[PDB]
Ligand binder design. Structure first.
Ligand SMILES: [Zn+2]
Lengths: 113, 112
């Protein structure tokens, strides 16, 4: 699930659409970094990844970006491919994934209001 | 801050009190693993660490454990020793830091 916390992109056709949504909209960043953390523990908890992927799928629909990101989150043979697609599409530094997961804590502070 | 979400320990005098609270209570895992994530990023955001440490301190009060874990969270020269005290007290292997931080996401589900 993801209730849209931000409006549609003004650059839906841009190769930067998803990367810019990530930067500008904390809620999309939270779901994206949550997904990275879930990926890193996929082999011990596939259901958590599946839920995080569904949440991300929900949040991506908010963006209006044209670029499709099929995570194939229920298909073990395609999990890696789908996650790499996500990284490519969002223009994430793929050598920094550990760090980005660790930032989920900063982006989703507790307690909060 | 931390709004106590679990009951205080049955073994407040024990050297195992904090490790036992961590084992039993998700809320204490949440604040502990959040602290770990904040520590891993200390060198780029000390304020976030200070806040997470204060939150952890508050969660420690909720446990009722007598043992102290002084994180020295405002003192750069002592952050390392404070965090090592945290690891020793909660019986967390330093090799496990990355994994435990990554688990904050699983233990703090969004949306909610
Ligand atoms: Zn929350």
């Amino acid at each position: 699930a993801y209730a849209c916390s931000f409006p549609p992109g003004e650059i839906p056709g841009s190769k930067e659409c998803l990367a810019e949504a990530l930067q500008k909209h904390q809620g999309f960043k939270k779901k994206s970094y949550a997904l990275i953390c879930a990926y890193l523990n996929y082999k011990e908890d596939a259901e958590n990844y599946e839920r995080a992927a569904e949440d991300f799928d929900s949040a991506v629909k908010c963006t209006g970006c044209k670029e499709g990101v099929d995570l194939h989150e229920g298909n073990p043979e395609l999990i890696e491919e789908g996650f790499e697609k996500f990284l490519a599409s969002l223009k994430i530094d793929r050598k920094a994934l550990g760090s980005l997961c660790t930032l989920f804590q900063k982006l989703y502070a507790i307690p909060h209001n």
